[model samples]
Target: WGYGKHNGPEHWHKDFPIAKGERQSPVDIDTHTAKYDPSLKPLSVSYDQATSLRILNNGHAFNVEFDDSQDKAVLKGGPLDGTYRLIQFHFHWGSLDGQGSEHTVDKKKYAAELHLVHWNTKYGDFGKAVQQPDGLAVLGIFLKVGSAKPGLQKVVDVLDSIKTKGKSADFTNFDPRGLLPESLDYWTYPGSLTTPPLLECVTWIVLKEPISVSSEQVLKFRKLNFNGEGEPEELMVDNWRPAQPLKNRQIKASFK
Candidate 1:
């Protein structure tokens, strides 16, 4: 079955309305007039010669994990008091519509969304890190359905490698940085993961602009399976939650 007007965002919570209480991501950041902090730096990530990347079939989602040893080594015993480690990365997409992105721009939704999750090394492990206030940081990027997204083709090419349930494939020599849009400008704020168990210590960095993909590319994502054993073979439909109430959080945009 596919998502229609009656079964789309408007009615997402009917079957599992607990989703309505979830801390949804991708809030449409209207305007940020706050002064920029030059000292508040971002973590540096390098994709060149990045190796030991492992892809996992978590049954619910496909995750790409990377080696964060280098970054962690440097951050230790340095000004960066909190060490960071790469946990995993996954995606969220709409079943039928090309405008299902979590974070919006002036209420404008994109086609898809990607989340690169990292955890603080201070906790020594992701399990513990997720519980701290400065525990996690997620880099969010939006993908629009169009023709200009050459970077997406790289991932799409490997779809066949992990098409079936419990299937996974190695993706060495892949530069994920290439997937980022040319404009790295982003909006940052304190928020929670879009899914349960809705933890609220996540530092979200949402890219301002979106990268482009084709309608065909989106169709491939729509074909993904979301069925669990004994459950009906349901297609991964409308994998995004609607925007959440701001709840008095301040969103800050990066200038550099």
Candidate 2:
């Protein structure tokens, strides 16, 4: 079950039962209902440019890999109790502009979404962490259409190198901190992974502020394919799963 009509988010529950669970992700943010939590600490982000290894297209999304063998890059504070190691960062975009972000604010969609995947240090390795409740801490940054962002431009420049599934290229000395917005304000909640496995082990920190990217920049993402070379053409567009039910969860805002 992929992003096509035959197999999409609507049909994922059949294969991954947790997709229908209470904490499924990519929920619409009702700003009016989100309560401010004064206890939420400021988010701390420290990235090492040298940690970026390569950028790749893994059939689902094109992600930039980070060297997580040590504590080079990490995320801490905010709603997270312990420091989480940065693993990889990727994007989810649509075939067109104005709509692509997985998590919507007041039902408003952005051109794309950036996901910085991390794992809790207490859990040892990412493999074992995926099974625990407080294992993963994913940072979700919204990408809206506007002037081009310098950070994202570096990524867009290399899309041609890895246009199909399973393709990868060297992507070193890249700092992801440039992709973040000026304010670190965000909404925190218990949620699952947006994609398959749909594991309900994530502590989601979705930023309230969105970064800007040009229409031309976002259009480049659509040039990617879900299929590899010499395979049937299957463009990778609208690769994000629609918002799932919020269920009994409460989304806490870090800022008033």
Candidate 3:
């Protein structure tokens, strides 16, 4: 149900050869070597609070979904070729502090990472957009351990209600931008989704500055149960796919 041995990241290549594709994601950002492109535009985020929909435990992590049928929430700039509609936002974390983030900087992991996934509307729908080379654009936000994040409490309060797998709740009016770091400075690159299906279709825009979350707050995240109602109790932790080979991919920074 998690990053298992036979069905997890290691075995993903057996069924989906693109899992080992050239532009895989969650790569270690070698800051010293990353080139800063002065031409990069500032990220454009306009989210309609009305689009926020539901939150569910997808076994791996709890994701907050949005209504993508309209242009309600979207990203338009910062290394992206076209406007991408927000579909959902989720997280990856380890059992402990400083060990959870899927992507790292100088080989350092954060407590967790937030991914707000979007799809280019040119292909019509998200299903069609996902398989294309420029189909997806995911905004990456790093979460470090510190004081409680005021904006997060609204989400934290709902953990108990969705403790089991497949459990979901009516989640709305949540502004994902509030969770973003102050600086719009970021790193950009062509990459694939960090998880299965492993489609080589994402353009990753990773933030440089991380927001804060108390260690106790992470405790609330840990309370989410990996098993469903009838299944044996299991903790959902370390749900991140391990860092894959960087291969020939390049990670470009939006800031100096």
lDDT of all predictions: 0.65, 0.91, 0.87
> Per-residue lDDT for 1-256 in model 1, tens only?
1244555555645554544543445466776443354555664554454453667545445677777655521221111345555566787787656566777766777777888787777777777877877788788888877675776676677765665457678876556776778776677777777765556657787777778778887787666566543556666657676687765666776663
Question: Higher-lDDT candidate among 2 and 3?
Answer: 2
| TM-score quality measure for candidate 1 | 0.78
At residue 225, give the lDDT of candidate 3: 80
Candidate 2 deviant stretches above 4 angstroms: 48-50
Q: What tens digits encode model 3's per-residue C-alpha lDDT throughout 1-256? A: 2476656777878778988789988889899988998888878987754378899998889999999998888998989877999999999988999688988999999999999999999988989998899999999999999988888887888888899989999998887767877788888888898887878899999999999998888999988887898898878888898787888877889887
Candidate 2 per-residue lDDT, tens place, 102-212, comes to: 999999998899999999999889988999999999999999889989988889999998998899999998889889899999999999999999999999999999999
**Positional deviation of residue 41's Cα in model 3 after best superposition, in angstroms:** 2.1
Best by TM-score: 2
Q: What's the lDDT of the predicted structure labeled candidate 1?
A: 0.65
* TM-score (all chains, Cα) for each model: 0.78, 0.97, 0.96
Rank candidates, TM-score, best first. Answer: 2, 3, 1
lDDT of 2 at 161: 88
